[PDB]
Design a protein around this ligand. Structure first.
Ligand SMILES: [Cl-]
Ligand SMILES: [Cl-]
Ligand SMILES: [Cl-]
Ligand SMILES: [Cl-]
Ligand code: NA
Length: 129
């Protein structure tokens, strides 16, 4: 599913991401835009052989099991394919574990490079939440 900006903002808000670990909703919408272009089916393969999955591009090296990343962890205890669902619950629940692990949203390279330090409130402007 390819979300609309305000549609995804509302879905993330109802799943508890607004101000989660101090990150306002615009940060999460901005990260999703640049990680996946709002597409739950996005996948991208990394140089180490791991793959990133879903709207928040969660990495199989640490967070999910895809059966082809040897020696990797599955810290969210989910198959990576569950992160590609039109229902963002599994991606949100895993993202909450990632953002809580000490490095905040810096785990998302596109957030660090394209959202951090910008007016992220602009990503939720006009939306009915
Ligand atoms: Cl915001
Ligand atoms: Cl594996
Ligand atoms: Cl959803
Ligand atoms: Cl933080
Ligand atoms: Na894994």
């Amino acid at each position: 599913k390819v979300f609309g900006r305000c549609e995804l903002a509302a879905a993330m808000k109802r799943h508890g991401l607004d101000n989660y670990r101090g990150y306002s909703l615009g940060n999460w919408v901005c990260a999703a835009k640049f990680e996946s272009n709002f597409n739950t089916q996005a996948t991208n393969r990394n140089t180490d052989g791991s793959t990133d999955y879903g709207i928040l591009q969660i990495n199989s090296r640490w967070w999910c099991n895809d059966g082809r990343t040897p020696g990797s962890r599955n810290l969210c205890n989910i198959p990576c394919s569950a992160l590609l669902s039109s229902d963002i619950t599994a991606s949100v629940n895993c993202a909450k574990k990632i953002v809580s692990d000490g490095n905040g949203m810096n785990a998302w390279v596109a957030w660090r490079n394209r959202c951090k330090g910008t007016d992220v409130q602009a990503w939720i402007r006009g939306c009915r939440l």
